[PDB]
Structure formats: structure tokens, C-alpha cells
Write a protein that binds this ligand. Sequence first.
Ligand SMILES: *[C@@H]1O[C@H](CO)[C@@H](O)[C@H](O)[C@H]1NC(C)=O
Ligand SMILES: *[C@@H]1O[C@H](CO)[C@@H](O)[C@H](O)[C@H]1NC(C)=O
Ligand SMILES: *[C@@H]1O[C@H](CO)[C@@H](O)[C@H](O)[C@H]1NC(C)=O
Ligand SMILES: *[C@@H]1O[C@H](CO)[C@@H](O)[C@H](O)[C@H]1NC(C)=O
Lengths: 386, 386, 386, 386
Amino acid sequence: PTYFQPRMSCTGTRFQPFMMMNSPRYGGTGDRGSIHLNREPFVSCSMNECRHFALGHTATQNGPYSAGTGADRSIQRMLFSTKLGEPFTIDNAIVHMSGWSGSACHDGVEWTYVTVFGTDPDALVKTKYGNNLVDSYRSFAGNILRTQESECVCLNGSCYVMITDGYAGGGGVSQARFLVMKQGKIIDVINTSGRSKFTEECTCAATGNTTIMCACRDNAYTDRRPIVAIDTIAKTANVGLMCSPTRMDTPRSADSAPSSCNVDDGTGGGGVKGGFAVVRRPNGNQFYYTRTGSASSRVGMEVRGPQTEDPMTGTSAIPLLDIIVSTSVNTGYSSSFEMKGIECDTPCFVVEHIRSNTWTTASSSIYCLSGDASMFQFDDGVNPTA
Amino acid sequence: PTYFQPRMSCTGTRFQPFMMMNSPRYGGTGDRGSIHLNREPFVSCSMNECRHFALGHTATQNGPYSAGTGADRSIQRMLFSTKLGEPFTIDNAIVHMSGWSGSACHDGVEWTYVTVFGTDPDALVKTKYGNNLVDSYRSFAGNILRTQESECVCLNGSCYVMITDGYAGGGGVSQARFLVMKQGKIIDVINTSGRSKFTEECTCAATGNTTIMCACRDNAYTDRRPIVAIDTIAKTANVGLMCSPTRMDTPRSADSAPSSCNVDDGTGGGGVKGGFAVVRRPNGNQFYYTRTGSASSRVGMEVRGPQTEDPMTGTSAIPLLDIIVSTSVNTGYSSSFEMKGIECDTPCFVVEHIRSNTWTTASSSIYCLSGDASMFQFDDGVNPTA
Amino acid sequence: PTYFQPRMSCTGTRFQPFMMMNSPRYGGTGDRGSIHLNREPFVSCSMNECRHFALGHTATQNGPYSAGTGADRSIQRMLFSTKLGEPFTIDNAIVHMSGWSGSACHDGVEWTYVTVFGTDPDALVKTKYGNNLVDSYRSFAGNILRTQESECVCLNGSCYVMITDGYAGGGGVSQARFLVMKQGKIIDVINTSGRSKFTEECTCAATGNTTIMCACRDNAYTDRRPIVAIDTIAKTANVGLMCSPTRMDTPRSADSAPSSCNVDDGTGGGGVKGGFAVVRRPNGNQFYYTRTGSASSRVGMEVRGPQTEDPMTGTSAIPLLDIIVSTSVNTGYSSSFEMKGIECDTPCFVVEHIRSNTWTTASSSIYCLSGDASMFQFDDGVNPTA
Amino acid sequence: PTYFQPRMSCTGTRFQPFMMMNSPRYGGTGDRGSIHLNREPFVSCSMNECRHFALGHTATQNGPYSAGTGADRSIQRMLFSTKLGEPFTIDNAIVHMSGWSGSACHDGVEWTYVTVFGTDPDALVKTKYGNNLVDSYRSFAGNILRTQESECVCLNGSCYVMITDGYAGGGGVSQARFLVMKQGKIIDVINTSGRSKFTEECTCAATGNTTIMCACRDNAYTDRRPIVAIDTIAKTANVGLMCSPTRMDTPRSADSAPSSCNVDDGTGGGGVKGGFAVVRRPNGNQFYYTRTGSASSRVGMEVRGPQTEDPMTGTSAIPLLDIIVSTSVNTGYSSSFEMKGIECDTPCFVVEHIRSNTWTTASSSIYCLSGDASMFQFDDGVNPTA
Ligand SMILES: *[C@@H]1O[C@H](CO)[C@@H](O)[C@H](O)[C@H]1NC(C)=O
Ligand SMILES: *[C@@H]1O[C@H](CO)[C@@H](O)[C@H](O)[C@H]1NC(C)=O
Ligand SMILES: *[C@@H]1O[C@H](CO)[C@@H](O)[C@H](O)[C@H]1NC(C)=O
Ligand SMILES: *[C@@H]1O[C@H](CO)[C@@H](O)[C@H](O)[C@H]1NC(C)=O
């Protein structure tokens, strides 16, 4: 009835610091806070509220169960969120469902949540709409089934969420599929084509009505991100590697043009989830990317400036816009979301900060498209031994 | 005006792990949480929210009053709940009324709460609707008056809650009655017939408009659960023992057919509240049951697959569907609830986990009907000496 | 527009235990809770929610400022409340305004709050409506200005709150006035007549449309409570002493008839706020009273049964209905409130329990009109040295 | 659609104690609370709720990060608020955006938030409306960009917020500008005229429809506050110094008339944000001011009585109304806000109290226009070493 449709983005040229959800700063052995242990934070917004989602380990930052929370998958993993702006404490967190992998988005009416939970070789995808469980999808490759770990994209009520299934190591194949949900019910599945061989942890944004574009991870063959062009009328997802000389993954080789756009050329396997933002304008879209600062290590964070060429076939270099996190500060996964205002959408990037001692926590820094001003780089301010 | 009526259930063949309300995992002597001490958790849902209900002891998990909270009845017992997904902490819990036994349900308009509180030989049932106390019912057998300890069933505004009163030991008689409430006011009382001799801790689900079916406990004569068929037009509750060779109580004898359906045959007295779910379909209902894993002890938990025969007179064995809790993990009471979605209902089972040191707490695991996938068995993850 | 008017009470013959807001049971030096230090708790209800109000000392139960919280008046006193059913913790409490004396009620549209704050010889009454400060009233006798410390009574939008001002010791005069507020604005002041000499801490309930009756304290001359009959059309408050042989204050002499209804006869000064409930029926009102158990000390608590004679001029004894608190448990102030349901009102009594070590706290027990059942007496369960 | 417009103020002659948001009184090394470290608190109100805003340091009152929170600007600074009446704890606080300087107000529909964040020589102003980031404004003088640190004024949807940029020391120039926002979008900028040389930390109140008046700080040349008269139709802000002999800043010289109204005459640089309230009446406006008690030090707090002459050119002395904080209690910044009731507005002053040990916190005392009664002076009651 009132389903959200993408709008043109508002005026701005830089992604300026907006909010820091540095949850594990009100905890520590010398403090009084009770904070969730989690990984892979992301933000999704409705037109009235933004929420900060994460996968927790059902344990406090400084508690008897904090050991063992560095695991990627466990039966204690759950998807939970708070409103953006809340400290992300145990009392403020709302658990949506169990799951060691997941995503969430809002269609303009109600929140849709997607998680993956189960045994590694046979995990199940479950979808929930409005606190009522709606649907499920079974593992298709016989390997760890994974989601975006970021916001899913809703177009007039149809929400497109990426799922993948396959071996994430060298020599593996991980062909992604996009589930199309309406009110949490899976109505369609769009399989990939093009360089479908390995698509993982896709960060997606709308490129206008009827079209979605994603920038994904490749953890086995290259260090150039796959770009997935989803045509929702043709019902096809065309995957290919960025032909740009600027490499967006971590580890990565020195920037250079590929000999051919879809040839595997890089440092080998491994990778990090990255950011991807689209600034939609009446005269064409501009694309922005996040990259770690130091090549070969998840240190620092840069924003690569507007690309006016197709992210797949442009072949031009992507200029540096700003350095948002210095190389003295460790970083993790990067994602993106859009605020949905009264008149326009506002692209924002989310930068993960990883902190550990005898437990592992995540902190997030949100940078939103705004006006031109000198960058004020952010240090998480979390001391694992505080 | 907008009273809820049962709907057909959605597609699914397995009860897959959904959410674990393992409240006493953010507490412990080494943590900073303040968590209620409680027993007999259950979940009830509205179409917009699900709530997790429990009977507390007005004490924290690790506090000066934690001793003595293993009692079944005390004047400090109270009925309280949080939204499903909340940690069930002291600050999130809302107390509804005092009571050492109780149930709750939502009729599509507002929440109805039922508790029993008073002296053992002369306890009083009280009903509340929408935070306003509405009605009461007095003890009828001169013994401990008890409720379902699970969700009550509302049919177009009329909510059916089980109450029982009698000696729970060997040689006792405990004849149940069903109170029919409308807006919390008791409008009718349906007495039982058939094997009315001992009916306790009934887990009820609708079997369609105008009909409710319950699977109850028998703690004195047998190890086969009583099944109560409630005809809301005829205003009769027909009770009889499951004629199936599969015995659902704990302790229980090895599975075997009874010599006659309502003959008392088993290991003697004792028992546990069990689960009972109905999958309503246009071509007939399917019934699902929970059972402990190890016969003679409350260890593990199994889900017994669809029974297409009448739960009372079928006489066929009920196949094993899944083992949801391994026998290395202790379990307690089992119950069931239904989520009420936009298009359909979703049957879910709730499995209690009991943990104690110098206090006693309960944790709950929720398994909801979903798609076919390998089972991922759950270990509560609560260390009484954490 | 939707202002509340009194309704007939529902069926019942006993005030049965309903809820215990024993806030200082989740605190203590061995616990993790942060609970307000307060005195004189009372409950007021809207048709959708009940709230528990108290005057706090802006300090935690076990904190660096807990010393000195036994004071009756200080600049750190504030009026705050939580929803009835909440633990009344620091995080759940909402502060309404500063004040060392106060009352609150709901008119069917929004909450009206009244407090007294200022210097003893020249304190100010302030009224607030809907979080916006509306009006004030200045001290009139040059002595400590006081309120009811209980729910104010709203009749079709006009809310009647008692204020008094005078010396509370022997030989003093404390003539009460009733402020009539509409949307928090003081529209009228009704002065008292009859035995106006000393009226304090009035517990008021409606006796039907256009009429309010209160049972007050007399802390200087007698041990019989003043009864105030407020005629809202005549705009008069007629005060006189209960002519009944049953004495409701503490300390009190042995029950005996007075030689004349308004002659000062008793144990001298001192007193306690008491309960007063009205069961409105089509054939006349019934009155119920609370009394301490042990005469001469605030120990235990009794409910004195229905009085069908005018509370002022009846002259008959008031029979004992139930003993609600045993004499092994210390008690404090008693008050009353009414729940406002869909069809009827439900009179309820609130019994204060006082606990102290190096701080002073209050706990409250709520007993609501319900069916006939044996009484289950309540022990606060709060250990000052827990 | 429903945008707020100023109303006439209600009856009253004194600003009487209303509420004390003494947040750091439920914390301390001996307590269990987790309270934000912050500075420059202020209150802004909607017609349904009042909120207490502050700039935090993302640290608890008694935690591992409490050192270093006495800084005026840092990357850990954020704007957050709670409802007025809440303890302002970590769990109740909602973070709106990052920022080391800011303001907030409500236009009758939704909350507008303004902050300044960035590097000192090139900071950015950002505006947010309804949890969605809307606009920004860049530094204009090449120096620290600052906001009011108090409520912004909304007239029929147009919200007027003061920003300034310049050197705050001796010999500096700090010319203010007023941004006019509608739904968070900056629609106009009104530059100042008159004694535009140094305008800072303006406390603004409406003087009627189409007009706003502010009393500002001057931290370099004088100890008389600048008054800014904003004509929203002429779109001009006329700045000049108070010609009154009563000096409102701190430090200040002994009261005396200036030789000429806009001649710099005082004790030199330095200053404190002060209060400014307007009582709008059909026969003209009255102005009220706050002043510290002890000249030359931020000790105590006085309210200077109604000024019926133009605050700029009156030249008469402003009589003392009340002493609201004694000189035994240290004070900080003062501001003002208006409650928006059903029929009228209610001017209120907010008095900051500064407390520090190894951390710095702020407490606030709210005094609202009410009736005539003897003043009850307030001592914060916060012990830095509690
Ligand atoms: C999508 O379509 C809507 C109208 O249905 C329009 O208002 C909006 O601007 C469009 N967005 C884009 C990005 O084209
Ligand atoms: C109950 O009746 C309603 C119509 O009143 C119908 O929509 C619903 O499907 C029925 N449910 C069952 C289980 O028969
Ligand atoms: C008060 O008047 C209303 C009608 O205005 C009526 O419904 C209600 O029952 C009356 N209450 C009493 C106690 O007479
Ligand atoms: C402002 O104008 C409105 C009508 O638009 C009026 O009701 C209000 O009283 C005016 N306020 C002042 C202060 O003049």
C-alpha cells in the first residue's frame, strides 16, 4: 500500500562523519555496562527510524561466556538490533531470530529480516516479516550458506536479498542467488550469470526503479570486486569483475589495469566485505567505494570518489575522495545504507572496527553524504583492556 | 470487533530452530546482568508481537534472595513477561499480577491474563484484561488449583483456559474445567467428561473454528497423555488417553500398544508438561508432539512427526520427525504456541531448559514450523556456576 | 471530550492480593539493581494503564547518597512514577517535577500531577497537565503545605485534589481545601466546613457523579478519621469525625462509642494515612477501610468490611472482613485507587511497607476487590541488610 | 501542516524551582549507575514532551574512559538526549549524531537537530530532521564554528538557529549568522549587523510572530551581553550591547552605566552563556535574565526581574527578582526554553552545575515561571568523590 520506492539523492560531494555506534566503549572490566559481543554490524533504515543490526553471541562484553565469541558460526549466534543512536546494550537489544548470517531491510510498511542458521553442509535461510516467521530456503551447493551481512534492497515492496553457497577457500565455487521476497514470502529466485563462479558478501544499492546493483567480495581468485547488475523485469543478475585499475579488496596487489576485465589477477584468495554507494541523479548515477587504507591488511579506510562509468566495464581509475580512517586504526567489514528522508535518499557508508582481548567485539562508524569540508578522521576509542 | 480467528497453517514439514530465550546467560556471578528467577516459561503471540511469559520469584539470578526460588508455590510468585526477543531482564520485565500458576493469550484486540494465587487448599483464579482486573473463579476440589502454564486459545473473542484442582499424587483425582472468557469476563465453564479422572497442565491448540484440542499431563496413573476434545458449540470437553503405542510423558515405559485405550498402564505417577501442535490444512489436521529424549528422565527432546489419525483413537505409532535437543542437555516442560501472520498461522514448540546452583532458572528454545533441513541441535549454554 | 466519569463497581466481596510492587527486593548490597529511595507510594489508573507514583530522594537504594533519605522534606525530593508492574528502578522511573508532597490522577484524556515544593513556612503547590506546567497555589496558613499523598478524583474532567496547611502537632489547626482543576488549571477552591479544625492526608474516592467522599487523618486530637463529604454542585466540603465505635487511625484506643460524634476522644496526637474504598452499587454505596493490625503501632493490616451507613453519622461498628497483613510484618501508609475497566470500576487498596537500614525505602502491596477465597497474607520479603 | 507558532505566556511573576536533572547523582564509584559524561545541557520542548539534550563524550561517569572528558572539542563528542524527567543514563540516552557543538528544537511536527563537527579551522554544521540527515553549512571564518548550545526558535515551521565562527580570544572577531531551516533544509541565512564584531552562545526566545530576540555572550571585549533583534520579514539581525547598567556576563565589573551603549567597557575577555526569557503579554513583552551570583566567578545564580524597556536601548537597571542558586554552589552555563501547553507557553530557565574529580559532568536545574512564593535555593547534591 505504502511501499517504498527509491528517490533521487540529495546534494553533496563528500561522505562526512555522521555517527559512531562504538558500542564497546561503555563496557570494559572497569565499567558498569553490559554490552553484546557481536560481529558484522550493519545499518538499515525506514523513513521514520534507522536501526543498527548485528549478529551476537548471546554473551556480554565482559562476562563468563565472552571466551569463544571470535567464532564465525555457532548455535549461540543470533540476529539482533537497536535503534540507530542507542548504545547497543543488552537491555536495548531486541533479538529477531537465531542465525549466524543475516540481513534486514524495510519495504516502507514493515521490517523484513533474513537469516541463515543450521549445520554448515545443510544450513537453512529463514525469512521473517513483522515479528512473524514467513518463509525459508534450503542450502543449494552443500556448503556454508551465507547472506549479504548488509541491507537488502526493497523496490515497491519486492525485497532483493543475496544468498550464496559454496566453498570459500581456494579452488572453490560460490554462485550467488538473489531471493525476491514480498511481505517476507519468497516469490522469486534470480540466479546469476556472467562471472557467476564466486560471489560473496554483496553490498547492494538501488540504481533506480526496476534496477539494483551490488559490489561483492571474491575470496579465492582475485582482489577486484564482482559487480552484480540485477534487472528486476528481465529477472537476471549479470556478474562480472570491475574492469577499473583501482582494486577494492583486501589483500590486493598494486593498482594496475587487468589484461582482460574478467581474468583472475590478484594476490590470491582472501578478502573483505566492502562498501558500495550509489548517488542517483537525473543525469546519471555516481558510484562510491570504500577501500582499506593499507594494501594487504585491514588497516585504515578510504572512500574512492565518484565513478561515472559503469562499475563493470568503465576501465577508468577511481579517484581518491577522502581518507576516512587513518592507518593507525584497524578496520573490518564495510557496508552501506541509505537514509530515507522526506524529499530524498542519503547514501551512507558503515565502517567496521574490530577489537579483541579475550573476546571479540565490533564497533561501527557511519559516514553520510554531506557538504564539502576537511575530513576529521576517526579513531574507534575502544581499549580491549580498558 | 477485530477478534482473532484461527487460520490455516503455512507450508512446512519440520520444526526448525527459531529463537532461544536463554535469559540466564547474561547473568552469573562474573557478569553485570540482573535477570529474573523463574519457572515454566511459555510464549503467546498477537498478530503484531510475541511475548514470553514466566512465573518469577521476585528475585535476581545472582542476588540475596536467590535461595529458595526452587519452590513451586510461594507468595512471592508473580506472572510477568517481555516481548519475545528481549533478554528477559529485571528492567524489561513487566509484572501483570501475583500468581504461582498462570496462562495468557491475545484475542485479536487485547491481552487476557489468567493466574492462580492463594493458599493451597483454597486458591483463587483471577483474570485480567488490558491491565484491568476483570474476574475470578474459586477453587472447586479443595486442593491446589492449577492452570495450563501455556497459551490459552481464543476463538473469535472467546478465550478457553484450562483450570484443574485436585491431589497431584498417587490415588488422586484432578478433574479439569475450561473457563470461557470474553474480554476477561468468565462467560461459561465447560466441565470435562470421558476419562476426566486426572487432567493437568494441558497444552492446547485450535483444530479449527468452533473446536479446540489439548494434550495434557497425567501425574498419577499412566504415562500416556490425556487428549481433551473441546466442542465449543456443544460446550463439551471429552477426555481420553492417547491410544497410540508411542508414550509421550516422562517417566514412561517402553513403547507398546495398550490392552485397551483408557486402561491405566505405565510406570506409575509423575510426569512432565509436553508440547502439542496442530498443523491445520484444508484436507485435515496433522498433530505433532514433543517428548523427552531419555525415557524415565527429563533429558533431551524429540519431536514426534505428523499424526493424521485422531490423537485419541488413532492407535497407530507416531513416527520420529527430528531430535531437537540431544540427551547431553537437560530439559523441562514443553509447550506450544502459534505465530499469527498476515496470511497464516505458524505452529511453534517451546522447550524448557532447567539450570540451578543455589537458585533455579529456566531457559527456553523455540522451534517453529519451517522447511526441510538437517537439524542443528541446541545446548542451552547456561553454566549455573558461570 | 473523552473525560472519565465514575461507573458502578463490579461484583466481589473481598479484597484479594493482586500485585506487590516490592521494588526494594531487586536491590541490596549483594545485588546488581539500582532502585530509587522513596516514601509514600500510591497508585493511580487510567483506563489503559495503571501507574505507581512515589516521592523519591534522587538516590539509589545502595549508593553514596542513601544516608539522609529518611527525611520527610528536602530539596532533593521529586515526584516520579513507573507503569504498574515495572520494578520501579532508576532506569524505568520518570520524574514529573520536584516536590516533597504530591498526588496524581488521570481525567480520561491526560495525566494531571500536583506537588508541593518550597520552604516549610511558604511552600508552593504546582500543577502540571500532560508534561506542561499549568498552575500554582500559594500556602495559606503559614505552615507546611501538604497534599493527599494519594490519587486525586476526576469527575467529567474536573479533578479534586486535597491540600492542607497548618501545624501538625498538638494544639495545631490544619484546615483543608480542595482545589478543583480542569486540564491542570485551578478553576475553583472548595473550603471545608464542619469539623474543619484538622484534616490531613485524605484518601478520596467518588461516591457517584457530582459527589466525592474522603477519609482523612487527624494527627493531634483524636484517633477517629475525619470524613469529608464533597458536593461538587453545592461546592461544599462537610467534614466530621466517624461516629462509628471502630477507630481507624494509629495509635488508637480500644474500640468504643464516642460520647458525641465530633468530641475529641482518643490517645492524643499522631496518626497514619489510611485506606478508604467505595463500592458503588445501584442500591447504595458500601465503604471499606484499612486499619493497622496492632493498636498503638503501625504493625499488620486489616480490611474493615462493608459499611452501609453514612461514614460520618452511621454510629454502627464496622465488621472485620479480612486480615491482609499479619502483625509480624511492619506497615506504613495505606491508600486506595480504582482500576477503570471496559464495563466497571474496581476498588483497590495499597498497603505501604517500610524498610530501613542506613536508608529508608517503601514497598507496596495492592489488594483489589475480587471473589471470596481464603486470605493469603503477605510478607514484604525485603531484608534491609540483604 | 501543524507547525507551532508562539503563544502568549501564562500568568506568573517568579521563576520557581520545577525539576532538577541532576543526572550524576545516581552514579559514583560507590553506586551501580552508568551515566554519560557531558557538558552544556539544555532543554527543548514539543507540545507533548520536553527533552533534555547534552553533548556527551561517549564515556560513563565512572569508567575507563572518563579521563580526558573535560575537553571542549573531541571526535568522541556526540549530541544525545532523553525525555525530560529521565535519569539521563547510558540506556535511556539516544544519540542523534556526532558533534562537539549543537542545538535542537521542535517545529510542531518533528524534531530538528543541528550540530557542528569537524576540524577546528574547517568544521561543518549539519542539520537532521526526523532521524534523517537533511543539510549542511560550511565554516565561513576559518576558525572554530559554534552553535547556540541551547534551543533554536521555530516560527510556523521556520527554525532559526545561531551559528558563529571566529577566534574566541582577545582581539578576535566572531560574527554570527542565523540559519533559517524548514524541515531541516536550510532555506535562508540572515547575517548580522550593528555590533556584529563578536556574537557567541546566543540564548534565543520568540518575541512574537515574525520576531525573535537573543541575548548572547561576548568573550573578548566587554561584560555586557549582545542582544540580537531578528526581524524575519525584513530578514535582518541587528546586534548591539545591552545599554542597561546591570552587567549580565561573568567575569563582570561592578554595575554602572556605560559612557555610550556600544562602547567596549568591562573586565576584558572571558564570559559565560546566560539565560534569557521573554514573557509575552498582550500589552508588551517582559524580559528576564540570569546572572551568576558572585561577580568575577561562576558562583551562584540570580534571576534579574522583568525589563519592560527594549533590552538593547532601555538603559534602566534591571531589578533583582530572586536568588535561585546560592553562592556556596558552583554554576555553569545558563539557558532558557519554553514549555508549550494547551493554552499558553511557559518560559523556563536552565542552570548548569559543573562537577569534576577525574572526569567532568554537568547537572541542570530548571526553574519555570509560576506563582509568588519564597525561593527555595538548590544545591546540586553531587559529590565528585561520592
Ligand atoms: C522511482 O519512481 C518514483 C515514482 O514511482 C519516482 O518518484 C522516483 O523518483 C523514481 N526513482 C528513481 C531513482 O528513478
Ligand atoms: C475460520 O473461519 C474464518 C472465517 O471466519 C476462515 O477465514 C478461517 O480460514 C477458518 N479457519 C479454519 C482453521 O477453518
Ligand atoms: C455517572 O454517569 C454516567 C453517565 O453520564 C453513568 O454511565 C454512570 O454509571 C454514573 N455513575 C454513577 C456511579 O452513578
Ligand atoms: C501568533 O499568531 C497566532 C495566530 O496565527 C496567535 O494565536 C498567537 O497568539 C500569536 N502569538 C503572539 C506572541 O503574538
